[PDB]
Design an enzyme around this catalytic site. Structure first.
Site, mmCIF file in Angstrom:
data_model
loop_
_atom_site.group_PDB
_atom_site.id
_atom_site.type_symbol
_atom_site.label_atom_id
_atom_site.label_comp_id
_atom_site.label_asym_id
_atom_site.label_seq_id
_atom_site.Cartn_x
_atom_site.Cartn_y
_atom_site.Cartn_z
ATOM 1 N N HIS A 252 0.912 -1.343 0.134
ATOM 2 C CA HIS A 252 0.144 -0.265 -0.024
ATOM 3 C C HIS A 252 0.581 1.362 0.153
ATOM 4 O O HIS A 252 0.241 2.116 -0.195
ATOM 5 C CB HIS A 252 -1.118 -0.108 1.551
ATOM 6 C CG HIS A 252 -1.945 -1.271 1.609
ATOM 7 N ND1 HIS A 252 -0.752 -1.953 2.384
ATOM 8 C CD2 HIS A 252 -2.758 -1.940 1.006
ATOM 9 C CE1 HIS A 252 -1.132 -2.732 2.090
ATOM 10 N NE2 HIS A 252 -2.753 -3.210 1.957
HETATM 11 S S1 FES Z 1 2.657 -0.993 4.562
HETATM 12 FE FE1 FES Z 1 0.633 -1.810 3.147
HETATM 13 S S2 FES Z 1 0.980 -4.070 4.139
HETATM 14 FE FE2 FES Z 1 3.128 -3.716 4.270
#
Ligand code: FES
Ligand SMILES: CCCCCCCCCCCCCCCCCC(=O)OC[C@H](COP(=O)([O-])OCC(O)COP(=O)([O-])OC[C@@H](COC(=O)CCCCCCCCCCCCCCCCC)OC(=O)CCCCCCCCCCCCCCCCC)OC(=O)CCCCCCCCCCCCCCCCC
Ligand SMILES: CCCCCCCCCCCCCCCCCC(=O)OC[C@H](COP(=O)([O-])OCC(O)COP(=O)([O-])OC[C@@H](COC(=O)CCCCCCCCCCCCCCCCC)OC(=O)CCCCCCCCCCCCCCCCC)OC(=O)CCCCCCCCCCCCCCCCC
Ligand SMILES: CCCCCCCCCCCCCCCCCC(=O)OC[C@H](COP(=O)([O-])OCC(O)COP(=O)([O-])OC[C@@H](COC(=O)CCCCCCCCCCCCCCCCC)OC(=O)CCCCCCCCCCCCCCCCC)OC(=O)CCCCCCCCCCCCCCCCC
Ligand SMILES: CCCCCCCCCCCCCCCC(=O)OC[C@H](COP(=O)([O-])OCC[N+](C)(C)C)OC(=O)CCCCCCCCCCCCCCC
Ligand SMILES: CCCCCCCCCCCCCCCC(=O)OC[C@H](COP(=O)(O)OCCN)OC(=O)CCCCCCCCCCCCCCC
Ligand SMILES: CCCCCCCCCCCCCCCC(=O)OC[C@H](COP(=O)(O)OCCN)OC(=O)CCCCCCCCCCCCCCC
Ligand SMILES: CCCCCCCCCCCCCCCC(=O)OC[C@H](COP(=O)(O)OCCN)OC(=O)CCCCCCCCCCCCCCC
Ligand SMILES: CCCCCCCCCCCCCCCC(=O)OC[C@H](COP(=O)(O)OCCN)OC(=O)CCCCCCCCCCCCCCC
Ligand code: HEM
Ligand code: HEM
Lengths: 114, 77, 60, 122, 57, 86, 387, 57
Positions: H23
């Site tokens: 993400h």
């Molecule tokens: S930073 Fe989003 S799951 Fe790893």
């Protein structure tokens, strides 16, 4: 066996008897005590027995006073000290094949829920 | 305005099915005793659990001595 | 007192019967554990690792 | 327990009755037990003591007619059909032939439901 | 027997009480000692710890 | 023989627990005399047509469920785009 | 007296299978119990056969399954039949529950049968999880890790129960051993509870679509209903053989043919399809303990049905509101399953929350209100017909 | 990852920490979340130094 069990269960239930049952029974007993003496023979027999056993013939006022003192807690105490889980003496005559043995009969005189 | 007018000393109380306040008041001691018995049974059937042993049984005086570990330096590797 | 009081207290109602049973069991477990611990400790003298410690390692 | 229909409360106000009559007519048409010729009182459950006692206090002809109606309805339901448009239950024959008896039995049972709870106020 | 009923009844009930106490103690002991097997075995408890050299990184 | 059981509602043949019957006549025919699959397609077609006509709307209005499914899927796809994050 | 009514065991068989009065107008929706029994027997036999080639351990389960697939004689039939039958079991279970719910079969005198069925449903759900967690693929590993962690929601002894169930500190050899040992035992308990189900049902008999007493007309089960169940059996066989011989991995996700890597977290951690709606209900609530409480209640609420139906009629055959609301609830259930299956995206959260709210409202608010309204309307119209 | 349990990459990201490409959440060299939808910092297990080695857990 069902009849014996239910009879002894109703016997044991008197430890928690209500207040309306006691009043109804008191009224019924007060009515029936002095309602079985109609003929002169019955009255004479009652007088003789009452004087023979105790020693005096209690006036109806005394009987009414003694009956009036009865409350539900006295009934509970007497049923707990006389009926609740106490020895019984039975006697059967006729076709009694379906009448269970002594221990099973006695087990019904004391309820286990309480 | 009375059940059995000739005997006004009687009355009818709220009830669902032989469930009346007079009878309800009588069965309270039985419920309390049964609850105490159930609690005692649950307690006695779980007294070697480490959490219960270290939280409830241990702090009590005169009983915690028996419910305490007695392992010297010879212990977990 | 007499013997009717004992019946009145524990052996009167089943609810006051099971609780007595459970409490007596809880105490009896501790009693028997103490008894067996004492008898086993008395049985073995100079035969366990705690009582042979100074002979071996205290001399290094 | 038991059905708690509140039509008696509604019938106090004639405004509500007049407003709700067409809706009730449409609902009774939509339920569609008349297509099998049954009366509304044949659909009530009979598995308790009250209904089993009430069914024993019915006139003989009523019981025989009820038996025939239920048998005909079952035979119709076996082969997945309905009665023609001329043999449907008319509103005139859709009356309450079971409610009064059940009400009487319930009243008798309720009557006893009081003496046991009797207390003395002193 | 020569006695009053309460003594005999109390004596009869005491044996059943002792029965129940001993049986409950035994049942609790065996239940716990048989359900403790599902806990973490001594083999797995040895591998829980991990050792890493601090100066090798 | 065994025991007197509780209060039930089935009994057995003979004592089925039903009400007293009177004036009922029932006919039938042997299965080896009747022609199977006689009056099948006509009756089945009529019954299916009637069932579709009457209980159709109770099921048809699975109607809004498909619409909400389609709208939700389309909106979720749209919001996960370049112009949806503006 | 004939032999079948004299010998004990033959009398036991006759009273339940040959001579037993039944309603004479029960539709084709009354055959699903026999299908359930056949599927359960098939599952028991297939599992017993499959247990002869499976080694329950972390480092050997997947290889054992593959060896079963491509080396054991006709092993693909065994595995495909086990999986597809386990899938069909829940379809037939849902159809059985729907039949019981639509016609108001929970009312007296068949409440005990309903409760026994609910218990059987819970046992079947528990049994399904252990069964699917055995192959130790990606989804099995991660779903087991997620689900068995839900036991920490209980107050006190929270993580201790999780550690006891895991037999360690993570999903490893001991928990697979436990799961394999438990998966063998539960079906026998299910069979015993099914026997109890049948013996509780037999005391009063089955209902009928009309909803009235069927004591006036009855026919024996032996010649009539032993041949009306054959069609359903053959149809179920033709349904399951197509899946077993043309699409064996039909209900099976793509992520179920890989070794369980404990380092790569998959994009989506979902259980099998038949447990999806309960997963959606659990995921709907932001809180943790409330989630498991609602998940349990979603299946435990079926025991409150008998004391929630204020209807003089028994069923939905002559209930205009019930027919509408039942299919509305079914559509809501399908929507819940779809939402639970997919990602937890933006709009899907709102849709799932609304669906869960409707699901818990249908059992608690709608039923009494519409039953009361129907009773009132019918009573009013009947009362206002003579004048 | 406290965000959704992904595997970040050490030293990845302009903060010199762990960056989660599932993400797009980056961490620093001290394991403190500063960019991305990650909700909390990263946890540390208990230990106790001994010799030149370490025991974890
Ligand atoms: S930073 Fe989003 S799951 Fe790893
Ligand atoms: C905990 C104890 C619970 C045991 C049940 C019990 O006390 O008897 C029922 C008894 C009910 O009878 P009651 O109205 O209290 O009057 C007692 C009479 O003496 C009525 O007594 P009875 O002479 O009719 O004897 C009844 C007794 C017969 O005597 C026994 O104890 C039978 C022992 C058989 C196996 C033991 C278990 O039966 C039971 O104990 C009940 C069934 C036993 C188990 C049933 C197995 C399958 C169901 C699960 O007690 C209750 O259920 C009330 C609560 C008591 C404890 C809780
Ligand atoms: C999931 C959703 C379903 C779950 C459960 C729903 C119900 C369970 C399905 C059981 C099927 C039972 C059934 O209908 O079959 C027995 C049924 C006999 O029933 P019955 O004793 O007359 O009484 C029931 C009536 O069907 C009742 O008649 P009715 O008046 O109510 O009218 C309804 C009529 C409606 O009739 C019509 O409208 C058609 C009219 C012309 C008939 C065409 C011939 C069909 C063959 O029904 C039929 O005729 C349908 C029969 C076709 C059987 C279909 C077999 C598979 C379907 C089962 C479920 C499908 C789900 C899987 C989907 C696949 C993809 C995902 O079989 C026949 O229809 C007779 C076939 C004769 C064979 C001739 C060749 C012999 C060679 C010598
Ligand atoms: C020619 C053209 C097409 C013909 C080809 C058809 C051949 C094969 C189909 C077989 C067939 O229709 O005949 C067998 C079958 C033989 O008749 P029967 O079983 O003796 O008659 C049953 C009653 O008399 C019927 O009584 P009714 O019609 O008065 O009552 C309405 C009926 C149904 O009728 C309707 O209202 C719908 C049918 C309308 C037709 C299409 C309209 C579309 C516009 O009610 C039900 O049976 C509902 C069942 C209750 C529950 C079962 C399903 C629930 C699922 C569970 C959901 C999840 C569980 C939640 C719980 C878990 C929570 C923890 O015919 C039917 O029953 C037909 C009704 C639908 C059932 C079969 C559906 C399969 C696919 C057919 C779609 C229709 C188009
Ligand atoms: C291999 C798996 C199947 C293996 C075979 C599976 C099938 C086994 C037999 C079917 C199930 C057993 C029969 C049950 C019904 C029965 O009891 O029939 C016995 C009849 C008489 O029965 P009844 O009608 O009640 O008359 C007697 C009434 N009295 C006079 C006593 C008052 O008396 C008779 O006329 C026939 C008596 C035969 C008893 C059974 C013998 C065992 C079978 C022998 C093998 C038969 C050949 C098999 C070929 C495949
Ligand atoms: C399977 C067993 C394994 C565990 C063994 C330990 C069990 C602990 C029991 C504690 C002692 C019993 C105290 C009760 C005394 C009492 O209250 O007696 C009262 C009752 C009835 O007498 P009454 O009311 O009519 O008396 C009237 C007074 N006026 O007698 C009993 O019900 C006997 C029950 C004893 C326990 C059952 C033993 C038999 C089970 C094994 C045989 C079947 C095996 C089946 C396969 C498993
Ligand atoms: C649920 C699984 C059950 C499977 C059935 C197995 C067969 C049952 C046979 C029971 C015999 C005793 C087993 C030994 C257990 C043990 O370990 O005795 C060892 C325990 C020690 O306990 P400790 O280590 O905590 O001492 C801690 C020290 N710090 O001595 C005792 O306490 C003595 C208790 C008496 C022994 C039992 C008396 C008879 C009980 C009858 C009721 C049985 C109920 C069974 C319920 C299913
Ligand atoms: C609010 C609830 C509070 C209740 C608290 C008491 C609950 C216990 C009741 C009886 C359980 C007896 C189990 C015996 C211990 C055992 O089976 O195994 C004992 C193990 C291993 O012990 P060991 O090897 O470490 O030591 C060995 C010493 N020689 O200990 C543990 O793993 C601790 C966790 C076990 C907890 C048992 C849970 C059982 C189900 C409880 C369900 C509660 C649901 C609540 C819902 C609101
Ligand atoms: C999937 C495998 C299933 C079995 C495979 C098919 C078996 C053979 C079927 C082909 C021939 C059928 C017999 C034709 C009719 C006849 O000849 O006899 C007719 C008999 C009735 O007797 P009657 O005296 O009234 O007959 C008139 C005068 N003689 O009806 C039957 O017996 C039906 C046979 C079907 C067998 C049972 C099917 C249903 C199973 C229910 C499952 C219940 C749960 C089980 C849990 C394990
Ligand atoms: C109601 C009964 C049963 C149900 C619902 C059920 C369900 C399942 C399911 C869903 C799987 C997963 C298979 C896969 O994902 O490929 C499975 C696997 C398995 N089951 Fe069952 N099962 C049942 C009965 C049994 C029985 C009675 C046994 C043993 C006697 C058994 C032994 C096994 C074994 C060994 C596996 C692993 C083999 C494999 O996964 O390919 N099952 N079960
Ligand atoms: C292995 C699982 C099951 C088996 C073997 C089984 C067996 C049966 C059978 C054969 C019937 C007769 C058919 C019928 O009346 O519909 C029946 C009826 C019934 N079942 Fe089941 N069943 C199972 C699961 C369930 C479940 C999960 C429920 C509820 C959640 C349930 C509730 C009922 C009810 C209420 C009836 C009575 C229906 C009526 O009399 O109209 N059963 N069961």
């Amino acid at each position: 066996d069902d009849l014996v069990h239910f009879t002894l269960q109703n016997w044991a239930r008197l430890t928690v008897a209500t207040r309306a049952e006691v009043e109804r029974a008191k009224a019924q007993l007060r009515a029936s005590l002095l309602l079985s003496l109609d003929s002169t023979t019955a009255i004479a027999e009652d007088i003789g027995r009452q004087l023979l056993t105790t020693g005096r013939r209690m006036s109806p006022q005394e009987v009414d006073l003694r009956i009036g003192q009865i409350t539900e807690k006295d009934v509970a105490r007497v049923a707990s000290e006389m009926i609740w889980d106490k020895d019984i003496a039975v006697s059967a005559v006729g076709s009694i094949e379906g009448l269970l043995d002594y221990n099973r009969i006695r087990s019904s005189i004391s309820m286990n829920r309480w | 305005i009375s059940f059995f007018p000739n005997k006004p000393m009687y009355h009818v109380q709220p009830h669902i099915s032989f469930i009346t306040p007079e009878r309800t008041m009588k069965t309270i001691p039985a419920f309390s005793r049964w609850a105490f018995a159930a609690v005692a049974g649950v307690f006695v059937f779980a007294m070697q659990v480490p959490k219960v042993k270290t939280t409830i049984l241990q702090p009590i005086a005169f009983i915690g001595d028996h419910f305490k570990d007695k392992t010297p330096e010879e212990d977990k590797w | 007192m007499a013997s009717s009081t004992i019946y009145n207290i524990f052996f009167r109602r089943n609810s006051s019967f099971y609780a007595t049973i459970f409490v007596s069991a809880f105490f009896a477990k501790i009693g028997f554990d103490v008894f067996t611990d004492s008898v086993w400790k008395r049985a073995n003298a100079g035969l366990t690792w705690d009582e042979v410690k100074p002979r071996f390692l205290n001399k290094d | 327990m038991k059905p708690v229909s509140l039509a008696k409360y509604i019938q106090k106000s004639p405004f509500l009755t007049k407003l709700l009559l067409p809706i009730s007519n449409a609902y009774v048409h939509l339920s569609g037990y008349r297509k099998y010729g049954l009366r509304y009182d044949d659909l009530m459950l009979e598995e308790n003591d009250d209904t089993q006692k009430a069914l024993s206090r019915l006139p003989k002809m009523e019981s025989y007619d009820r038996v025939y109606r239920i048998r005909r309805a079952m035979q119709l339901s076996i082969e997945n059909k309905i009665l023609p448009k001329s043999e449907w239950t008319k509103p005139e024959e859709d009356y309450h032939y079971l409610r009064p008896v059940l009400a009487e039995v319930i009243a008798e049972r309720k009557e006893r439901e009081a003496f046991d709870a009797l207390i003395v106020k002193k | 027997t020569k006695s009053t009923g309460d003594r005999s009844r109390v004596i009869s009930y005491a044996m059943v009480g002792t029965m129940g106490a001993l049986t409950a103690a035994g049942a609790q002991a065996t239940v716990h000692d048989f359900l403790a097997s599902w806990s973490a075995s001594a083999d797995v408890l040895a591998m829980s710890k991990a050792e890493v050299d601090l100066s090798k990184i | 023989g065994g025991a007197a059981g509780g209060k039930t509602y089935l009994g057995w043949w003979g004592h089925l627990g039903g009400p007293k019957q009177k004036g009922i006549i029932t006919y039938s025919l042997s299965p080896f005399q009747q022609r199977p699959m006689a009056g099948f397609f006509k009756t089945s077609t009529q019954n299916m047509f009637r069932r579709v006509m009457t209980e159709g709307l109770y099921v048809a209005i699975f109607g809004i469920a498909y619409y909400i499914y389609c709208w939700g899927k389309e909106r979720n796809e749209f919001l996960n785009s370049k112009h949806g994050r503006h | 007296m004939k032999i079948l009514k004299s010998n004990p065991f033959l009398a036991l068989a006759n009273n339940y299978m040959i001579d037993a009065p039944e309603p004479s107008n029960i539709s084709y929706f009354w055959n699903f119990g026999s299908l359930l029994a056949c599927v359960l027997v098939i599952q028991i036999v297939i599992g017993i056969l499959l247990a002869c080639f499976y080694i329950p351990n972390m480092d050997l389960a997947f290889l054992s399954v593959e060896r079963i697939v491509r080396d054991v004689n006709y092993g693909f039939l065994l595995r495909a039949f086990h999986a597809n039958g386990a899938s069909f079991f829940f379809i037939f279970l849902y159809l059985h529950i729907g039949r019981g719910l639509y016609y108001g079969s929970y009312k007296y005198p068949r409440t005990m049968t309903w409760n026994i069925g609910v218990i059987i449903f819970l046992l079947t759900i528990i049994t399904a999880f252990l069964g699917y967690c055995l192959p130790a693929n990606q989804m099995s590993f991660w779903g087991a890790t997620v689900i068995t962690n839900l036991l920490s929601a209980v107050p006190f002894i929270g993580d201790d129960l999780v550690h006891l169930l895991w037999g360690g500190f993570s999903v490893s050899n001991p928990t697979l051993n436990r799961f394999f040992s438990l998966h063998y035992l539960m079906p026998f308990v299910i069979a015993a509870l099914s026997v109890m189900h049948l013996i509780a049902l037999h005391t009063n008999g089955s209902s009928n679509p009309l909803g009235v007493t069927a004591n006036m007309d009855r026919i024996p089960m032996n010649p009539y209903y032993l041949i009306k169940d054959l069609i359903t059996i053959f149809i179920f066989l033709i349904g399951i053989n197509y899946m077993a011989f043309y699409n064996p991995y039909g209900f099976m996700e793509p992520d179920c043919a890989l070794p369980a890597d404990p380092l790569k977290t998959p994009m989506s951690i979902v259980p099998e399809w038949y447990l999806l709606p309960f997963y959606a209900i659990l995921r709907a609530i932001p809180n943790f303990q409330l989630g498991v409480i609602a998940m349990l209640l979603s299946i435990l609420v079926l025991l409150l049905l008998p004391l929630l139906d204020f209807s003089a009629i028994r069923g939905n055959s002559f209930n205009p509101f019930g027919k509408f609301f039942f299919w509305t609830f079914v559509a809501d259930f399908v929507i819940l399953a779809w939402i639970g299956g997919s990602h937890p995206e933006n709009v899907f959260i709102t849709i799932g929350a609304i669906a869960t709210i409707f699901y818990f409202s249908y059992f608690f608010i709608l039923i009494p209100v519409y039953t009361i309204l129907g009773n009132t309307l019918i009573d009013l119209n009947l009362s206002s017909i003579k004048r | 990852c406290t965000h959704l349990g992904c595997v970040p990459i050490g030293e990845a990201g302009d903060y010199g920490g762990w960056f989660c490409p599932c993400h797009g959440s980056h961490y620093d060299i001290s394991g403190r979340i500063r960019r991305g939808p990650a909700p909390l910092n990263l946890a540390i297990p208990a230990y106790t130094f001994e010799g030149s080695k370490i025991i974890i857990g």
